Amino acid sequence: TLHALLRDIPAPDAEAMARTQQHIDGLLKPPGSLGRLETLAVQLAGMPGLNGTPQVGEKAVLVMCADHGVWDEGVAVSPKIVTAIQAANMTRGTTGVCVLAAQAGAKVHVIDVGIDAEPIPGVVNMRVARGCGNIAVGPAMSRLQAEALLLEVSRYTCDLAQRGVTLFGVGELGMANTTPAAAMVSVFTGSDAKEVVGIGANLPPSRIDNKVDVVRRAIAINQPNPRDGIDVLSKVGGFDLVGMTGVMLGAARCGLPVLLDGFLSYSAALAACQIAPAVRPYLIPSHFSAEKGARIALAHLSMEPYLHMAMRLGEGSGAALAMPIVEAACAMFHNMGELAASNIVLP
Amino acid sequence: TLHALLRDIPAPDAEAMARTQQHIDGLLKPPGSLGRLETLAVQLAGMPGLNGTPQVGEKAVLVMCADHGVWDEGVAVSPKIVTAIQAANMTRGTTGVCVLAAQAGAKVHVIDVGIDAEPIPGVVNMRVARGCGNIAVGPAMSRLQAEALLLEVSRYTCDLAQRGVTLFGVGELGMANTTPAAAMVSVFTGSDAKEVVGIGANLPPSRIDNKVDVVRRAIAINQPNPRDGIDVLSKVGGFDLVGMTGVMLGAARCGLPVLLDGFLSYSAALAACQIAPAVRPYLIPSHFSAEKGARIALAHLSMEPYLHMAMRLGEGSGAALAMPIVEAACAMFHNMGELAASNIVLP
Ligand SMILES: O=C(O)c1cccnc1
Ligand SMILES: O=C(O)c1cccnc1
Ligand SMILES: Nc1ccccc1O
Ligand SMILES: Nc1ccccc1O
Numbered sequence: 165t166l167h168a169l170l171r172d173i174p175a176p177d178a179e180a181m182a183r184t185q186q187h188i189d190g191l192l193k194p195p196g197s198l199g200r201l202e203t204l205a206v207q208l209a210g211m212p213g214l215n216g217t218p219q220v221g222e223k224a225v226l227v228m229c230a231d232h233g234v235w236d237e238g239v240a241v242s243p244k245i246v247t248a249i250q251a252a253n254m255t256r257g258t259t260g261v262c263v264l265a266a267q268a269g270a271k272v273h274v275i276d277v278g279i280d281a282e283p284i285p286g287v288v289n290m291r292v293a294r295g296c297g298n299i300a301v302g303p304a305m306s307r308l309q310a311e312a313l314l315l316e317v318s319r320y321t322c323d324l325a326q327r328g329v330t331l332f333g334v335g336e337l338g339m340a341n342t343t344p345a346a347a348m349v350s351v352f353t354g355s356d357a358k359e360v361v362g363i364g365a366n367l368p369p370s371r372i373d374n375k376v377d378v379v380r381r382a383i384a385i386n387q388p389n390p391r392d393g394i395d396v397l398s399k400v401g402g403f404d405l406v407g408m409t410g411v412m413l414g415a416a417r418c419g420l421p422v423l424l425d426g427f428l429s430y431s432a433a434l435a436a437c438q439i440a441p442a443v444r445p446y447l448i449p450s451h452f453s454a455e456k457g458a459r460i461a462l463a464h465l466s467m468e469p470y471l472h473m474a475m476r477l478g479e480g481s482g483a484a485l486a487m488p489i490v491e492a493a494c495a496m497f498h499n500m501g502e503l504a505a506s507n508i509v510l511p
Numbered sequence: 512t513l514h515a516l517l518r519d520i521p522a523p524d525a526e527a528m529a530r531t532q533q534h535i536d537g538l539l540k541p542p543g544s545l546g547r548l549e550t551l552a553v554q555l556a557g558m559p560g561l562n563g564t565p566q567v568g569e570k571a572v573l574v575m576c577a578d579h580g581v582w583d584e585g586v587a588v589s590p591k592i593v594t595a596i597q598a599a600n601m602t603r604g605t606t607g608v609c610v611l612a613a614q615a616g617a618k619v620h621v622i623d624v625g626i627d628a629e630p631i632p633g634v635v636n637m638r639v640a641r642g643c644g645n646i647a648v649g650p651a652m653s654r655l656q657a658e659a660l661l662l663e664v665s666r667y668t669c670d671l672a673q674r675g676v677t678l679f680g681v682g683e684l685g686m687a688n689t690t691p692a693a694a695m696v697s698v699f700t701g702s703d704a705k706e707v708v709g710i711g712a713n714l715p716p717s718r719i720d721n722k723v724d725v726v727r728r729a730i731a732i733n734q735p736n737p738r739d740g741i742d743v744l745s746k747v748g749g750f751d752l753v754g755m756t757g758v759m760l761g762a763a764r765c766g767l768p769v770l771l772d773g774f775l776s777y778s779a780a781l782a783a784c785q786i787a788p789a790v791r792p793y794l795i796p797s798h799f800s801a802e803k804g805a806r807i808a809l810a811h812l813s814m815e816p817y818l819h820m821a822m823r824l825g826e827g828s829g830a831a832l833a834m835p836i837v838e839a840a841c842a843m844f845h846n847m848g849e850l851a852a853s854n855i856v857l858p
Pocket of ligand 4: 242246250337365477478479539540541
């Protein structure tokens with residue numbers, strides 16, 4: 165079922181992209197002057213789920229929530245229960261993603277893939293377990309659990325496409341999750357833990373060393389295979405991370421765009437592209453995370469974010485903030501006048 | 512009258528800013544996690560025209576249009592008449608700024624400060640002359656003309672504030688205007704012309720040398736005084752550039768924020784800050800222009816743009832694109848829930 169899914173990811177439509185580029189070149193402006201907005205418009209035009217043109221219909225931010233066993237290693241200063249509390253707030257519209265998504269006209273879908281607490285009413289239930297295993301002493305989960313969640317989340321994502329959603333945004337919520345994120349980045353990029361381990365949610369500078377040590381132990385003990393994204397996710401990842409990877413595989417299979425968020429999302433995207441390179445064309449960066457390993461992770465994905473906001477909240481907040489930018493590419497494409505109609509000729 | 516104006520620019524309200532910072536720190540998120548969005552919110556709170564809080568009411572983009580005598584030196588490949596044509600399109604909603612401003616819910620005000628063509632119906636008439644003097648052989652205009660336009664535009668800007676406008680965006684339109692922009696940047700920053708002269712609207716690489724030469728001649732012949740922003744503007748600037756400087760002085764006097772656009776706007780802001788350092792606190796960067804001298808100009812203004820879009824259209828298009836970001840800071844500030852209300856305590 166997963167092989168089928170990965171097999172059916174459509175390649176971008178080069179024909180629609182060429183038509184788009186020609187149309188953009190003819191707009192009321194010096195050719196190429198709107199830079200990355202032009203490039204983004206063309207990219208969108210190549211996505212089969214969008215009907216050959218840069219269009220944006222309904223918008224959704226999927227937030228994957230889960231707890232992590234590695235929290236017990238003292239790698240995070242936020243109380244573990246904050247995952248459960250914030251997930252509930254996500255249903256009240258008071259969180260950072262909620263407020264930014266509301267501003268963008270997007271709906272937030274809160275999905276519980278493994279919070280260590282009783283079920284929260286109003287949150288989508290796809291709970292694998294009450295938190296994943298502590299990666300410092302063994303794997304986060306079984307390969308089977310990782311594959312099942314990928315399928316599950318993937319289907320949910322592409323099913324939203326049937327409800328008019330054309331643009332996705334991915335996000336997470338899970339105390340201590342910048343630890344497995346860093347382990348994955350280290351593994352996929354071949355970078356040393358010290359180079360990609362950050363302060364997460366205000367970790368005191370004095371406790372960084374321990375965090376770096378925990379990441380190295382996780383890798384040494386699990387021996388994840390860099391060439392197998394599912395192996396890496398199941399061993400040194402987490403449920404929230406697997407879920408984000410699933411949103412990306414689902415949107416790609418649906419031929420639709422997905423906006424990345426910050427550091428946690430970069431880790432998930434490295435996994436997704438490792439598992440299926442065909443996913444890459446559908447990914448759109450949003451902002452440049454203030455987390456230490458962001459530069460390395462983005463360099464390996466060959467992505468240059470549009471927004472430099474020193475943000476490090478997570479939740480899909482950056483994804484929501486960039487949605488207007490995607491709408492701008494559409495507006496540009498469909499609403500600008502044409503040079504020829506004004507009798508203007510430029511070399 | 513100009514001395515009065517400059518004298519009456521209010522300092523930022525430190526009391527409102529402290530109250531803002533405390534409120535932001537108490538929001539549902541790790542302290543400081545929304546980074547530059549938090550900083551922007553505080554900055555807005557200190558602006559007297561906004562009522563002690565980051566608020567955005569009506570939005571306006573002021574586009575200053577004028578022609579330049581230096582066009583005759585072969586520094587621009589766009590036909591001179593494009594200024595007049597595009598200014599007319601600005602009244603039809605088909606231009607790049609129009610489309611992006613519409614997306615942001617802002618109104619575009621097109622102001623003719625010196626187009627070399629017959630008056631265009633629908634465009635605000637503040638025409639100094641039919642194009643400014645060719646800076647390669649003498650000054651763009653008299654000091655008197657520069658001061659009069661500054662006053663004129665300044666009053667117009669702050670008068671809009673009485674109509675509910677709380678956020679301004681500045682833009683321009685004028686063939687060959689990246690030449691005087693570069694001369695001004697060179698003068699204010701002490702950088703050599705070759706380091707700040709760019710391709711403007713697709714100038715062929717083979718004609719760059721001539722453009723660099725024209726900039727040096729302009730400076731040698733006029734001998735503008737770097738410590739006198741009005742001297743520089745009148746000698747090696749242009750009507751559109753003076754006008755943009757005027758919007759900045761007017762918004763500051765009104766105690767309101769102004770969003771910069773690209774390279775031309777950076778030149779105008781260097782002049783504005785030279786003339787009145789008190790203007791600085793009211794300036795908000797938008798994007799990082801793809802023009803060659805952008806880095807140097809931004810470094811001298813100590814500004815780090817939020818958007819990296821490789822844009823180089825001008826017209827205030829970048830300013831419009833960043834307006835949602837300013838609205839996001841307000842949304843964050845007013846709509847997020849508080850940590851205490853959720854019983855969350857973080858170190
Ligand atoms: O980049 C992120 O999304 C991030 C960084 C630190 C802590 N939480 C989220
Ligand atoms: O940065 C700008 O605004 C710009 C650069 C080149 C040509 N026109 C405008
Ligand atoms: N629209 C346009 C066209 C040519 C040169 C500059 C411009 O802003
Ligand atoms: N709201 C929040 C609080 C603590 C840690 C991470 C979060 O996203």
